[PDB]
Amino acid sequence: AVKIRLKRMGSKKSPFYRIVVADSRSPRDGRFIETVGTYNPLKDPAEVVLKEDLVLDWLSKGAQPSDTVRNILSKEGVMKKHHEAKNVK
Template identity: 55%
Template sequence: MALKLRLARAGTKKRPFYHIVVADARSPRDGRFIEKLGTFNPLLAKDNEGRVVLDTERAKHWVSVGAQPTDRVLRFLDVAGIVTREARNNPESGKPGEKAVARAEEKAAKAAAIEEAKNAPKEAPAAEEAAAE
């Protein structure tokens, strides 16, 4: 049985409150769980002690047994000093897509054409002035 340390949502609409639970990976998010390890209240300030309440001894036990924490719970365990979380780095995620690159190139080409038209020598008006004299 694959075990997960994850959040189970409680609270009302637009007032989230989560229980940190150990559950079978196949069970639904708010469904059956094996043990409740703590709570997470995202509405509290980040420096508030009541934001994350965690039974560290039980969490250590479940991690040692092989339960896999989700990303958010892994952050909590890292702050508690139970598990180390490696920082994620995806430099590809910040790059624009193909269409955005094409649009940027098109915009740059239009801007260059306008700039070139502004800086072009004005020979036609000079010729008209000479003809008028």
């Protein structure tokens, strides 16, 4: 059950998140496999940076996003590309 989920990295009331691919048994801030982009809930139009050439490779191997990761992966047009590669060939 590989996942693609968020990981908290702020101070106390100014949170920040790294987008990371981890085994689902791991702790939220513990071990992971690799990091895939960044996400900032402040900064009114929220800031996303991500590689999007590893997201498409993990997605095709059975990794699965959480609910917020799917929202910010569709705002970037990554889910459409998965759609157009899988069920189109």
